[PDB]
């Protein structure tokens, strides 16, 4: 219904959305609810997402179950990934549950372990980003990744279950800040239609 071509944040039907790129061509069609369609080309970095911020300072147990029931028509022509994306605070962690990717499988390096969630096996990774932009300014924070061992582009992502598995692997879970269904592109072109994105909370 509404198409965005330039960096913007906002809300639609209760969902926080963002289009961002540092340079290049981007189009994000806001299609209601959690749904959005995007196209990129000639970009360095871009992202497209719809999700929800939680507010306050509450743990995943306090919030209740967080899940995404999603479907994406996913056609990256180069580097890209399709994931649930979000942040915790106390401690500050940028987290990723990646179900598909383009030419490169993120994040690199070697996994801490593997977990089994929503019928799929996920490699688990932890990294540190030093003095990088974040939801709390330029600072140092951890990244948590679950990355599916084989690509898929529709199904349920039970975010809470990844949180619990990460905890069991020793990765500390603080208060949940936001979670969103997210398409990233890097030095590439592509399209991705998130035609279904039902976020459920509790």
List CB contacts of 38: < 8 A, sequence separation 6 or more. Answer: 19, 26, 27, 28, 29, 48, 183, 191, 192, 193, 194
Q: For the CA atoms of the chain, what is the radius of gyration? A: 16
Handedness of CA 28, 29, 30, 35 (dihedral sign): negative
Catalytic option among 6, 150, 167, 184: 184
- Rounded distance, CA 129 to CA 60, Å? 23
Q: Provide the resolution (angstroms).
A: 1.5
Catalytic option among 18, 94, 126, 161: 94
Handedness of CA 178, 179, 183, 184 (dihedral sign): positive
176 C-beta neighbours (distance < 10 Å), count: 28
Tokens 């306090």 sit on residue = 62
**126: annotated active-site residue:** no
b/e map 82-101, b = 16+ CB within 10 Å = bbbbbbbeeebbbbbbbbbb
- Rounded distance, CA 116 to CA 137, Å? 34
Handedness of CA 66, 137, 190, 100 (dihedral sign): negative
In the chain, where are the structural domains located?
A: 2-201
**6: annotated active-site residue:** no
- Rounded distance, CA 54 to CA 181, Å? 15
Alpha helices in the chain (DSSP H): 60-63, 159-168
Q: Which letter does DSSP use for residue 153 in this model?
A: -
Method: X-ray
> Under CATH, which architecture does the 2-201 domain have?
Sandwich (2.60)
């Amino acid at each position: 219904a509404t198409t965005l071509y330039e960096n913007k944040t906002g809300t639609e039907d209760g969902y926080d959305y963002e289009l961002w790129k540092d340079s290049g061509n981007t189009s994000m069609i806001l299609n209601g609810g959690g749904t959005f369609s995007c196209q990129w080309s000639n970009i360095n970095n871009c992202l497209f997402r719809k999700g929800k911020k939680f507010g306050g300072n509450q743990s995943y147990q306090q919030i209740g179950n967080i899940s995404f029931d999603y479907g994406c028509d996913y056609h990256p022509n180069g580097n890209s990934y399709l994931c649930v994306y979000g942040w915790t605070t106390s401690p500050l962690v940028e987290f990723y549950i990646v179900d598909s990717w383009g030419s490169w499988r993120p994040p690199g390096g070697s996994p801490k372990g593997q977990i089994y969630v929503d019928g799929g096996t996920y490699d688990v990774y932890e990294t540190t980003r030093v003095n990088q932009p974040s939801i709390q300014g330029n600072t140092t924070f951890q990244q948590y990744f679950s990355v599916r061992t084989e690509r898929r582009t529709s199904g349920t992502i039970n975010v809470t279950e990844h949180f619990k598995a990460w905890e069991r692997m020793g990765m500390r879970m603080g208060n949940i800040y936001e979670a969103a269904l997210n398409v990233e592109g890097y030095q590439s072109s592509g399209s991705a239609n998130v035609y279904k994105n039902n976020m459920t909370i509790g």
